[PDB]
Design a binder for these strands. Structure first.
Ligand SMILES: [Cl-]
Length: 276
DNA sequence: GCTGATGCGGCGACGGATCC
DNA sequence: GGATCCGTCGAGCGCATCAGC
């Protein structure tokens, strides 16, 4: 079935208007995404904060266009030190964060270019490009050990300020989160191990899945489609991209959007509206 | 400098069997 | 004998390195 994201709900359960718009996009090659006009789409979305994943771009290679975003002028970038051309994340913000850090505890020795932490007045934002389990699950054990390290890391942060985690978490949590659950149960992104890791992330930190919280029974809502086999035109997809929130932020939650129509990557943007 | 091949990382279509 | 299950295979894209010029 095709999918039509419902209209933007811009007011919280208590009637407060949204004051903060966060957009997250796994761009699958930041320089190619720009050439495919992804920044034109960002401009129309006008987020306060833009998180980008799979940029595949070290900071010296950022296109000039990123220097022409006056409403997203505070920019933080990360890319892995060995595997240049892979992973890579970015966080761009209208207002300057109070603190920024990289990685999940030892980035200075294992510069992975997967995680950015930014602390604002009212919340801490984490964006992540979570390690894929690999074709044939060759890196699944690593993914499980990464999941555990990440959970512990985030539990520490959320003990201080409320947490917003966004990005490509690279698992479809439940069967409703992908088009072909039965055929993919031995594939990266839908193994029992990865699904369990996501469930434990929600329980241990604790975090809520903003979109599923608002739309608990809505199927065919995906954020990724393989480039092969015309999967996007058929909406044969996976929901890999999330906004997870501390429970205490749920009264600020206005809406969590899937921007299905925005092209330029094999993932689409997702957008969060918060009343802070 | 530039192009294009190759390497590497990030699953749905289809054929055949099985279920009742 | 239509629906479902299951395993196999052939498959887009981006960016790095490498060869060639
Ligand atoms: Cl990558």
């Amino acid at each position: 079935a095709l999918y039509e994201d419902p209209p933007d709900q811009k007011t919280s359960p208590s009637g407060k208007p949204a004051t903060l718009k966060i957009c997250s996009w796994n761009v699958d090659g930041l320089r190619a995404w720009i050439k495919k006009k992804g920044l034109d789409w960002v401009k129309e979305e006008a987020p306060d904060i833009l998180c980008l994943q799979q940029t595949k771009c070290s900071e010296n290679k950022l296109p000039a266009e990123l220097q022409e975003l006056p409403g997203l002028s505070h920019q933080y970038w990360s890319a892995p030190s060995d595997k240049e051309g892979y992973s890579g994340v970015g966080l761009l913000s209208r207002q300057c964060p109070l603190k920024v850090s990289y990685g999940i505890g030892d980035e200075e020795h294992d510069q992975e270019g997967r995680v950015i932490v930014a602390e604002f007045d009212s919340f801490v934002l984490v964006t992540a490009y979570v390690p894929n389990a690999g074709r044939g699950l060759v890196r699944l054990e690593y993914r499980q050990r990464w999941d555990e390290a990440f959970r512990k890391f985030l539990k520490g942060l959320a003990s201080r300020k409320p947490l917003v985690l966004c990005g490509n978490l690279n698992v479809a949590h439940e069967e409703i989160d992908l088009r072909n659950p039965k055929g993919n149960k031995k594939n990266a992104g839908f193994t029992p191990q990865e699904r369990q890791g996501f469930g434990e992330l929600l329980q241990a930190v604790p975090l809520a899945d903003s979109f599923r919280h608002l739309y608990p029974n809505t199927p065919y809502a995906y954020t990724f489609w393989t480039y092969m086999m015309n999967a996007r035109s058929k909406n044969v997809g996976w929901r890999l991209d999330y906004f997870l929130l501390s429970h205490s932020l749920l009264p600020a939650l206005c809406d969590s959007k899937i921007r299905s129509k925005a092209l330029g990557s094999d993932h689409c943007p997702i957008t969060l509206y918060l009343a802070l």
